[PDB]
Amino acid sequence: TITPSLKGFFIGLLSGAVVLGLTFAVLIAISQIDKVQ
Amino acid sequence: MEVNQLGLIATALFVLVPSVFLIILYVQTESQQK
Amino acid sequence: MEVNQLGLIATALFVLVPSVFLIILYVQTESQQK
Amino acid sequence: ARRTWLGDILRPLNSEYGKVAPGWGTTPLMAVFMGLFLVFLLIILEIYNSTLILDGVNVSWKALG
Amino acid sequence: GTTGERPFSDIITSVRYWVIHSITIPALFIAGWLFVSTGLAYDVFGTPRPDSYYAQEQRSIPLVTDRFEAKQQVETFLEQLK
Amino acid sequence: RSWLATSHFVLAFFFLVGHLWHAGRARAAAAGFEKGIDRESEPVLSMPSLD
Amino acid sequence: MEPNPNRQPVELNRTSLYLGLLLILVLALLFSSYFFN
Amino acid sequence: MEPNPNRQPVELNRTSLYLGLLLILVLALLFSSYFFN
Amino acid sequence: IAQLTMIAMIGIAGPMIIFLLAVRRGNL
Amino acid sequence: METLKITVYIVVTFFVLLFVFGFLSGDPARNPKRK
Amino acid sequence: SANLWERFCNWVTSTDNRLYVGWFGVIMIPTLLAATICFVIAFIAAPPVDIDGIREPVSGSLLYGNNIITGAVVPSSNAIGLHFYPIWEAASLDEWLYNGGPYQLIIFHFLLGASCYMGRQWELSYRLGMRPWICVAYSAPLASAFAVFLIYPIGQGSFSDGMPLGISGTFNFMIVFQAEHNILMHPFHQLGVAGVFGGALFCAMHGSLVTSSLIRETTETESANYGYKFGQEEETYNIVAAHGYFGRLIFQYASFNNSRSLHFFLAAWPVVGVWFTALGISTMAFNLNGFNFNHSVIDAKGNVINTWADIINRANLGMEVMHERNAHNFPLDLA
Amino acid sequence: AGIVGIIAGLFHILVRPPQRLYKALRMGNIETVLSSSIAAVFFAAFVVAGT
Amino acid sequence: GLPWYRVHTVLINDPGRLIAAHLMHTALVAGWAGSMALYELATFDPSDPV
Amino acid sequence: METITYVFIFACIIALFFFAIFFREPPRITKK
Amino acid sequence: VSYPIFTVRWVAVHTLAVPTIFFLGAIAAMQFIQR
Amino acid sequence: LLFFFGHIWHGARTLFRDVFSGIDPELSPEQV
Amino acid sequence: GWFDILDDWLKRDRFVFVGWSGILLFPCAYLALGGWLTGTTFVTSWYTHGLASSYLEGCNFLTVAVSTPANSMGHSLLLLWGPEAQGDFTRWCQLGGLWTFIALHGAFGLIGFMLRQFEIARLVGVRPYNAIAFSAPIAVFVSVFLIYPLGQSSWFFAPSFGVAAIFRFLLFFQGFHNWTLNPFHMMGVAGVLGGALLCAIHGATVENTLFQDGEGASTFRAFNPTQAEETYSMVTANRFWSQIFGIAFSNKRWLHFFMLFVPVTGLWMSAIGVVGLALNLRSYDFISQEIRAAEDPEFETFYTKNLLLNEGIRAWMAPQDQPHENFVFPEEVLPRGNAL
C-alpha cells in the first residue's frame, strides 16, 4: 500500500491543482475589478 | 480452382458497364422537371 | 510478369465505380428542365 | 401525422422537447464527476504506462494463468 | 484601431524607458553571463564539462539501460570520474 | 574556381530576372498600363468571347 | 454558335431500368461460367 | 402516401465532373502500381 | 590584436554624417 | 541519317526565322493603347 | 489579301485564339510537341540504357518490366558526358537508344519550350494590357528545371548525372545528391522548404480566411459557391471582417488589411524561396556544398563527441559507399 | 460501469439539461449529438488500437 | 440544388427516414459480419492449431 | 496486362484534358 | 490619453524579453569556453 | 485519426450554423 | 455571476487576445517554446544518445537539439516526479525528460490554439474555416511526434526537436521505411508543392491584373481598405490563363476554397502514411520486381538502385544511431561498392 510511485502521483496531482487554483484565483480576482458597461 | 484469370473482370465489366448505362439514363430521365 | 491477380480488377473497379457515380449525377443534372 | 399502437405508448417519452432546467441547473455537480473522471482516466493511464506502480498490480503478460 | 495599451513607439522613445532599461537590460545579460562563466549552468542541467565526457582510459558511452533504476545508474556513471 | 563560378552564376541568374522584370515593365510603361488596367476602357471586355 | 435544332431529350422509365437490369444480370449469370471456364 | 416534403434536387456541374474524373484517374494512376505490386 | 577599435569609429561614422545633419537640419 | 540532319536543320531554321522576323515586324505596336 | 505575312503576323499575335499561340509559341509548340511525343514513346517502349557508361544497361520503360512508380527515361551515357548526341550522331537507332539518346532530345526540347512558355506568359499579358511579371513568378520553377536538367550536368561534366525522367529515378537523384553534397545542411535548400512549407501554409492561410469571410447570398441547402457571379463589380468577401479575425488571432499589426500587400507577399515568399533552392542546386553543381560539422565538438582530451550532424554523416556514407557499385575504380569520387 | 450506466441513465431521463448548457452545446439540434458521438467514437478507436 | 457531398442532409429533420437510414446501415454491417465469417469458414484450416 | 492498364489510364487523362479545355462551360459574365 | 503602465501586454512582452537577453548573455559567454 | 476531423468539422458546423452560408454587414472590430 | 464577470474580462479586446482558450494555450505554448530554448542551450544528450546537443557543449543553431529519451525509458511519460527522475530536476534533464515535456505541452498548446481560432471566430462572427484548415498541422504533429513512436519500441525513435536532428529523421525513413516510395507521402508533397504553387501563381496573377486606382507606380497605396469594387480584374485573369494554360478560374469563392483543400488534404494523406509506418507497415518493396531481380541478374531499374542505397544507409548508420542495440559491424560485413 501507498508505494513511492503512488506518493509521487499525489505530489503531481496536488501540485497540479495548486497551479489550477492560483491561476483561477488571480483570474476571478482581477476579473472582478473592471468591466463597466 | 483452375479457372480463367480474366473470368472475374470479364464478368464484372459485363455487369457494370451496361447496367451503369441504364442507371445513367433512368436517373437523368427521373430528374426532368414536369 | 509476377504481379497480383486482383490488381487488374482492383484498378478497374477503382476507376469505374466512382467515375460512374459522377457521370450519373452530371447527366441527371444536365437533363433538368430550365 | 399518423398515430399507431406502438406510437401512442411511446408518445410520452417524446414530448418534453424544449424543456430545460433554469439557470446553471445541475452544471456544478456535473463538473465534479467530470473532474473525477479526468483523474480516473489519468490513473489507469499512468498504471498502463508503468508511471504509477502498485505492489499487487503487475502490468505484464505475467500475473496471469 | 487602438486599445488601452500605451503605443510602443512612445515607450521605446521615452527617456524614462531608457533610464530604466539601461540598467535592467545589461543586468540580465551579465546575469546570464555569470550563469555560464561560474559553471553553475553545468550543475543545473547535468551537462558534462569538456573534461567530463569519458573516464581517462574508458572510451565507452554512459548509456542508460533501464528506466526505473536509471537515476541510480546515472549516478554510478558520475562515480568513475566521468 | 568554385567560389567564382557559384558566385557569378547567382549574380548572372538574378540579372536574368532583373532583365525580365525591367523589360516587362518597360513594355507596359511605354504602351501605358504599368500601373493597372483602365477601369473604364478594359481591353479584354472589348474582345470577342472564345469560351 | 447556333443551338442545333435537331436534338431531342432521352428517356428511360423505371420499368425499362428493371427489365434492363434483369436482362444484364441473368446474362451474366449465364455466361460467367463460360468466362471462368 | 403523402409526397415527402424534405427532398431537394441533386446537382453536379460539368466542371465538377471534370475535377472529379481528374481526381479518380490520377489516383488510379498512382495506386495501380501498388495494386499489382 | 584588437582592430575592433577601427570598425567602431568607421561604423559610427556612417550614422554620424547624417546625425550632424539632423542637428544642422537640412537636405535629408 | 545524314538526310535527317539536313531536314531538322531546315525545320529549325524555319521557326527561328519566323521568330526573329516576328518581333521585328513592329511588335511594340501590337497592344491596347499607346503605340 | 492585305499582305500574307502581315496577316500571318496578325493571326499569331491574335488575342481571339482559344489558345494564344504567340511568337514565343512559334518556338514553344513545336519543341514541346517533340519533347512530349518522344517522352511518351520512350517511357513505354524504350530499351535499357547504359547510363553510367560502364556497359550496365538500366531498363526504365513499361514494356521492359517497369511500372509508373519505377519507370523512367534514363539519362544519356556517361561515356558521352557533355557531348552533343543527336539522332544523326549515331550509326543506328539501336545505338542511339542504348546510349540514352532520347534523354537529350527531351530535356533540350523541354527546357527550350519551357523557356518560351515563360516568354509567352509575358506576350499575352502585353496583348491584354495587363501588367507583366507573372512570367517572373514562373521563372522560379523554370530555373529549377534548368538547374536539375542542365546546370548540374554542366558542372558535374556529364548529362548522366542529370535528374532522370521518372518517379523512382528522381528519388535516386536526391539520395545520391544528399550523399555527395549534404544538401539538407545547405542554407539555400533550407530556404527552399521555407518557401515551400510557407507557401502551402500561406496558401491554406489565405484560402481559409477568405472563404470563411464570405458575404451571405446563398440558401442553407445551396452551394456557397453560387453566391458569386463571373464578372462582378464588388468584392465577394468581407476583407475587413477577415482582418478583424486574423488580427485577433495573433495581434493587429501582424495582420494584413491591404489586399495588394497581401497577394504580393503571397507571391513573393514562395517564388523567392524556390529561387534560392534553384540557386542551391546550381551552386552545388560546382561542389560548394552544405555545412560540414563533422567531428566539430571534441572534449578536453581530443575525443570526438558526436552530434546529430555526425549521425547524418553516417547515413551519407552509406549512400556514397553503395551508389554506382561498379562505376568507381579509385578512392576519391571526383566526377 | 453497467450499474453506473443504469444510474446515469435514470438521471438523464428525469433531470432536465440546465438552460446554460442547452444553449451552449446547441441541444435540440441533432447535429451536435453527432459531434459528441464521433468524439467518443474516435476516442474509443484510439484505445482499442493501443490495446 | 444540393451538392453531391450534401445528399444525406435530406435527413437532418426527418426522424422517420433517418431511422430507416440507420436501419439500412446496421443491416449492411450485420450483413457483412455474417458473410465475412462464411468467407473465413470456407478458407480456414483447423488441421493444426499449433 | 499491366502496361495496358497504365497506358489506358494515361490515355484517359489526356482525353479528359481535351474535353476540359475545349468542351468546358462557357464562362458567362454578369448575367449568369 | 492617460495610458497605464503594467498591462497584460507588458506581462507577455516580458515573459519573452527577460529570458531572451538572459540567454543571449549566457550564450555570449559560451563563446570563450575551450579545452 | 480520420474521425478526429469529422468531429472538428461537425462540431464547427453546429456552433457556427448561423454564420454558415456567409456573413453580413456592420463594421465594429478594434473597439470594445 | 462571477463566471460572466470572468468571461467579460477574458473576452476583452486587448492587444493580445486572451480568451477562455488562452487559459490552455499560453501556459503550454510558452513552456513548449521555453523548454526547447532551454535545452537548446543548456541540456545535453550524452547520457541518452551519446550526443552533444547544446550551445554549452559547442553545438550551433543547426546541430543543437532536444533529443528523445533513451530506449530504456520505453513510452514512459517521464514526469519530473515520476519513478525515473524521482522529483530530481537535473536527473530529469539527463534522462531526456524535456522531450516529453516539450511534446506533451506543445501538443496541448496546439489544442488551445485551434480552440482560440474557434473562440475568436465565434466572437467576430466569422466562419471557422481557419480551424478546419489547422487540423492538417495537428494530424502531422500527432502522427509523427506521438502516434509513430507509440508504435515503435519507445520515444527514442521519435523525431528529436532540432534542425539536424530532423534531417536524420528524414534519412532514417528513407533507409529503413523507403518513405519516398509511399503513395501517401507522394500525395503529401503533391499537396505541399501544389499548394506552394497556388500560393505563388494566385498572388502573381492578382498583382499583375490589378486595376489602376492611383496615379503612382507603387500601386500599394491605391487600395481601398473598405471593400467596394474588386481591386483586380477577375475577368482579365480568366481570359489570360484560359489562353496560356487552357484552363482558368472564374469563381473566387471556389478558387479560395481550392487553396484551402489542396494543402490541407496533402498533409492529411502524409499523416496516414506515417500512421502506417508506426506499425512498420511501409511501402518498401514491389514483389513482382524482387522476384525477377532474384532470378535475373541483368534486370535493373531505378527502384533496385534505391534499395541498395537503403542497405548502405541502414548498415553504416545503425551502430551510432541505435546505441542501445550495442551493434558491432566488422569492416568485412559492411556492404560496399567498388573503390569507395
Add this chain to the structure above:
Amino acid sequence: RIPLWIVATVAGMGVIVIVGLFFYGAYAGLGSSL
C-alpha cells in the same frame, strides 16, 4: 524624446555585434574543430 531612427540603428548594430560574436565563436569555442 529619443528619435526612432537612432533607436533602431543602435539596436541594429547591437544585434550585428552579438550575432557576429557568435560567428566568431564558431572558429574558437567548443564548436570549433581544433
Add this chain to the structure above:
Amino acid sequence: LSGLLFLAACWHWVYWDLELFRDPRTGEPALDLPKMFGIHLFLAGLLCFGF
C-alpha cells in the same frame, strides 16, 4: 438479422410521417434529444451489466 433490419428500414422509409416524431406543441417534426440519451444510456448500462 440483416434481412430483418432491411425490411424494417423499408417500412420506416415509406411510413416516415409517424406522429411520434411530431411535437404536440409546434406541430412540426422534433426529437427530444436529452431524454432520448437518458433512455439509450439506461439500456446500454443495463445491457453492459448483464454482459
